[PDB]
């Protein structure tokens, strides 16, 4: 039965994401904040995609890094072909959805990956942060406040539901995000921001002693 | 079955990895030390990859030599395309992980291999030696002190756990590595170093009478 085989793939993909560590992304006063539980120092789950578009993922590394690379490729080819301000988080999210659907139906094994594409406004501009979550099948969801990916998402999502506050500063949003993530030191956290105040490249990692001071 | 493949392929390749000689790599004062149990004089399990990046492997010779060659190819194409100091042990390890994952899922038989990529700092520079272990599936692990590959890894890994000392000289690290490997003369040992003191090319074999003096 095709429907039973599809349930076999849906189930397969859900279990792999559960094996992966958790990631959260939430809106705060200066933009968007990515906080992931990541022990390695070389392997990363948060990345710049374009000037104002960031990316977080949770699942099999050799696949969401494949998607990371494809997305970078796409964004730069568009930006050069048209212009930088034409590439938007919405296009990127849509491409990931088409690609994960095609993979989910056509390839042997479905990517066990969960994606979050984030976008902030340009410099000196005003607009609310946009978060999109793309799941393994191709489904895409528009999130107003925060996205939680990988592992057991219920307790983290609820803790964030109680603690979230719009226009929280960088330090408060970091405390809320680490707290809800616990439901970890600088040696087990990957933290980055989409700082809306930067002139062009908004993505910026917060590591080491600066991260130490913030948390 | 999707479950059958992952569980059966895993067993077929872990068997073939335990079905082979043992190699150790450990950090010492002058860089990194590779000590392998190798009877042949033509077939080698330790190799230079790039200026400061070395490579050891355990499993099926034709396959980890295929990986050896691929890695050399990669490193030189990068070094020429960009520059020599841009190729890092981290990139190499990552490529081996992607390739062993793709092989493990797409080819008929999984590569019964276990890899260790080692890197030291450049000349007159200061930085800790980095050891990465890549397993047959694509998994990659960051090791601070030593890697043990192939055969029965438990007794060797424990003996090294008791004997290891950071900043041990070349002779002491050789004694520790041979001792823990026994848990063999110059006619059954392949010994090389990533000497951090060399100006450019750090890899250097220790064979014959010089090896005789060291051990």
């Amino acid at each position: 039965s095709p429907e039973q085989a599809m349930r076999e793939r849906s189930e397969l993909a859900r279990k792999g994401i559960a094996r992966a560590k958790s990631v959260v992304a939430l809106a705060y006063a200066g933009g968007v904040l990515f906080v992931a539980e990541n022990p390695s120092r070389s392997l990363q789950k948060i990345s710049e995609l374009y000037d104002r578009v960031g990316f977080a993922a949770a699942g099999k590394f050799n696949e969401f890094d494949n998607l990371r690379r494809g997305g970078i490729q796409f964004a730069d080819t568009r930006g050069y072909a048209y212009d930088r301000r034409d590439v938007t988080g919405r296009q990127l999210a849509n491409v990931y959805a088409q690609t994960l659907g095609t993979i989910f139906t056509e390839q042997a094994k479905p990517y066990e990956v969960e994606l979050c594409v984030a976008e902030v406004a340009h410099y000196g501009e005003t607009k609310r942060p946009e978060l999109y979550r793309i799941t393994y099948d191709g489904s895409i969801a528009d999130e107003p406040h925060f996205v939680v990916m990988g592992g057991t998402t219920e307790p983290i999502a609820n803790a964030l539901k109680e603690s979230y506050a719009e226009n929280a500063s960088l330090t408060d949003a970091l405390r809320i995000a680490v707290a809800a993530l616990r439901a970890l030191g600088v040696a087990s956290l990957e933290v980055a921001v989409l700082d809306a105040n930067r002139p062009r490249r908004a993505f910026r990692r917060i590591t080491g002693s600066a991260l130490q001071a913030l948390l | 079955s999707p479950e059958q493949a992952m569980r059966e392929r895993s067993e077929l390749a872990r068997k073939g990895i335990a079905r082979a000689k043992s190699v150790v790599a450990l950090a010492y004062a002058g860089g990194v030390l590779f000590v392998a149990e190798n009877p042949s004089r033509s077939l080698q399990k330790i190799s230079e990859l790039y200026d400061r990046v070395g490579f050891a492997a355990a499993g099926k010779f034709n396959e980890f030599d295929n990986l050896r060659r691929g890695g050399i190819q990669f490193a030189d194409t990068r070094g020429y395309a960009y520059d020599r100091r841009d190729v890092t042990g981290r990139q190499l390890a990552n490529v081996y992980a992607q390739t062993l994952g793709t092989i493990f899922t797409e080819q008929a038989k999984p590569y019964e291999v276990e890899l260790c990529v080692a890197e030291v700092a450049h000349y007159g520079e200061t930085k800790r030696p980095e050891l990465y272990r890549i397993t047959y599936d694509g998994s990659i692990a960051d090791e601070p002190h030593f890697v043990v590959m192939g055969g029965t890894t438990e007794p060797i890994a424990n003996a090294l756990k008791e004997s290891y000392a950071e900043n041990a000289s070349l002779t002491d690290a050789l004694r520790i590595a041979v001792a823990a490997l026994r848990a063999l003369g110059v006619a059954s040992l392949e010994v090389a170093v990533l000497d951090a003191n060399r100006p450019r090319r750090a890899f250097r074999r220790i064979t014959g009478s010089a090896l005789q003096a060291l051990l």
């Binding site: 792999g16 094996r19 992966a20 560590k21 099999k60 590394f61 050799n62 | 899922t105 694509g138 990659i140």
Partner: peptide, 5 residues
Amino acid sequence: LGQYL
């Protein structure tokens, strides 16, 4: 393949 981040 136990490589999940």
